[PDB]
Structure formats: structure tokens, C-alpha cells
Amino acid sequence: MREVISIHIGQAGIQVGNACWELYCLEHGIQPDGQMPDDAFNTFFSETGAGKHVPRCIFLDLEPTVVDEVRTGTYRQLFHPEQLISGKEDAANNFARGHYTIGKEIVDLALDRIRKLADNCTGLQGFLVFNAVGGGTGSGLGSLLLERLSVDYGKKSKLGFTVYPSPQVSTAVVEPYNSVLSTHSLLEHTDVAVMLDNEAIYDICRRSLDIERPTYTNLNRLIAQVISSLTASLRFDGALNVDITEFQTNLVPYPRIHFMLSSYAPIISAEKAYHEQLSVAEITNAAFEPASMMVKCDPRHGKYMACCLMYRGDVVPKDVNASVATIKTKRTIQFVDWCPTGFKCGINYQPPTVVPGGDLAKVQRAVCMISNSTAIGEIFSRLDHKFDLMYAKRAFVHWYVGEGMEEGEFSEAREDLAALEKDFEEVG
């Protein structure tokens, strides 16, 4: 009835996919061996002819090493090996390798698997992308994929959770290049785009959970909680349910501005949780705190074009409209003039689940926030500077023009970065 197709490209995508699909199989009683001892899982699973539940995901990569780990990991009895895709060679952080040379010869395999995956669903809500901008596979292939998707469906909605090159912490050297080439090529195809950065979540681990040893696992854990709270309306009951259709239309006013931030609350260990009572207000207050964001973007330098709140657990709608009224009275928050409204709130009755051996704690209340603000152009501006800072020197370019690219794409993508940045200014 109501189903989603979760895609995981690049290294980070198949990393978080291990976390989310750990969470879901845990939340619904699904054992690692396919079966559990309706529609509560059909949004994420397909009950086979008998017993087994296969997760309706897909894992794409050009490095065999990680998808091989899932094949030998505990969750090999879940994924039809038709889903786990790999490649003999990787992209090596070159956009053209993931986009022009190697990407082209394998998408026919992916779209085959996807065509085999959409026909099973009777009502397809939309695709769910987990991209990793800054690499050759995530940026190069992911962009190449979305074009193949929009030429196919178009009418379908495309949602994207992409990690964005953090300004300070930079594990790569060339990631401004392929990121620029990605954003341009993806924009006109994705209908909405959410971006998150690892460095912000690192700070989140420090203040709230207080873990001085944050690994890629813990970060992947938190994303699972966010998405589990989002899809909560799709796969559960609760007053003011939300679906992707009405969710997207009340959040993207203009076709270009679909770039949005996120936030989650509460985020607390098992000890601070005992000395707390967790009223809805403080959760919503923390959810609007700029520090509690997952991006290194300050919203207090722009305005909120719209906002959406997905609660969880025991909440009553009168507590919601009261707490939100505590926000719209505050001065530290700013909104654009052409929207008196801007809050699409949703409630669900199933509390958040916790993973044994995980970092979160058992709480009966939970809130995730997604807002569209014009301030995001600030972190967009940094990538604007860094590109020409190295493009004038034409550094690393001999790779691209040697890997089946030219110099126009640098200039062509360059203009649309300028073009987008002005659009974020025209809304002022």
C-alpha cells in the first residue's frame, strides 16, 4: 500500500544502511534470518511465500570491500544477493570515473534491480537516497542514477539524504570539485534535498551523549533514529499522520529551493534521562536550538521559509500547538514574510526504539525537526570560494579531462552555483 525504496550509494550510504536496517528489523521483531517469531512492515519489507521478510532496500558501491562485509556480516540472511551490488574497480574520488566511465556500464544493472523492486509495490510513495557527496561513487554515480530515475518516472518524488563536505573537517582534498559537479547535476532531478555533516553530529555526541570516542557507527546510529521517526507516520498510527506527498508540497515553495536542514531531540544517555521528565516544550526548544542541528549552518543568519515537526511516543496535539506557540513568539527565530504558517506537525503513538549495545537510551518522547531556511547559502558560499581557489590553478584537472570530462562542466556547474546563491538572496 504505502512503500518506500531506500537506496544506499557510496561508502557512507551502505554504512548508514547497516544502521537503519538494524533498527527496523529490531523495531518490528524481524530476526536476522528473514522471519519474525499487516502493513506494519510492508513499508519496508516483502513477506515472501512463507515466513521470511526481505527488506526493500538496495546497496550500490564500486569498492567491493564494504558490501562484502555485509555478505559475511550477521545480516546476510536478510538481503537477496541480487540487492548487494559491487564493482571490480572503484571511482577513486574522481567524478568522471563514477559518472562517465564506470558508472554508465552498471546502471543498467541497478535499474534492472529497481524495476524488479517497484513492481512489487502497489503504491510507491517515493525513493529514499543515502548519498555521500565528496567521493567518486556517491557523487559521480548518484547523480548519474537520478537522471536515469527522473527519465523513467518523473512523476515520482525523489528524496535525498546526502552528507555534505564539512568546511573544517575534510577527509579529502578534491571533494569541492565532485561536490560542485554533483549539486548541479542532481538539483533539477531531486525534488527535495536534505544535507547533513559529520562534524556537527560529532559535536552533538560530545555535548549531549558525552562520548569522547565518536566513530562512524554512532553517527550512523543517530540518522537511523531520525528516519525511523520520519517514516513513523507512514508505517504506524497516530493523530496528524504525514505522507510524503503532502509533506513535500507544504515544504518546497519554489522548485529550486528544496535544500533543508534537520534536528533531533531528545538526545540523552541513560543517566541524565533519570534526572529529567522530558516535557514537550524543552524538546521542541532543543529541536530549534541551532547547536542541536546536524549541519554546520547557523539558522540565526537567515529566515525559516517553512518547518516540519515529527513527534513520537506520548504526545497530545494540545501540547504541540502550545509549544510551537512558544517558538513563534520568540525573537531569536526568523521567518520569511510570505508565510504566516510554516509548521506541518505530525504525531505518532509508537515510542522510539533503542538498540542493545547502542548509545541512546529508552525514552517515551522524541521529536525530529526539518526546516527550510535561506541561511543555507552560507555553507554553499564556502564551496563557491574553494572551487575557483583551485580551478584558477587548474589543479587535479588533468585527471578529469583524462577520465572523460572537459572544462565546460567546471564552468557550467560554476554558474549554477552562482545562480542558486542569488536565488537564496532573492527570497530576502
Binding site: 567491493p64 558490501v67 562484502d68 544477493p81 548487494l84 559491487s86 564493482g87 571490480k88 552498471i106
Partner: protein, 86 residues
Amino acid sequence: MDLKQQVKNYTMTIRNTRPPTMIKEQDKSEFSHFRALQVLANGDEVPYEATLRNVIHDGARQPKLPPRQTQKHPGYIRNESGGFFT
């Protein structure tokens, strides 16, 4: 087709008409082996070959060539897309 093959076919027809009775194609001293074993049970003095009995079967032709392993190591070859062989 020819004389030799017609004689061949007649012999094979006889083989099929007769029941093979799952036979063992060699018969050793059955009751002598039983009697020798009974002599061993109490008298406690029997020749070794008298105690022995031997039975043979056809088994097969093709004298145990070693296995081909039908499969490489799952670190060299991958299916079409990354994936083991089975």
C-alpha cells in the same frame, strides 16, 4: 545393425529379462564362514582365513580421479556485480 551388435543386443536383452537380484558378482564361503565363526564363539580355535569372508561389488569404473573443486576461492572471482558463487 550388424552381426556383432545384434549378438550384443540379444545378450543385453537376456540380461534385462533376467532379474539382477542386486547380485554381488562374487560368492565366497557363506556357510563355511558362519560355521567357522560359531567354532570361534566357543571352541576358540579357528584358522584366520576360515574366519574371514570376502564380498565384492561392482562399485564403478573411473578409478577415483581427484576432485576438480568446481569453485575458486571467494576472493578472486565475483558473480556479475559483487557476490559469491554457489
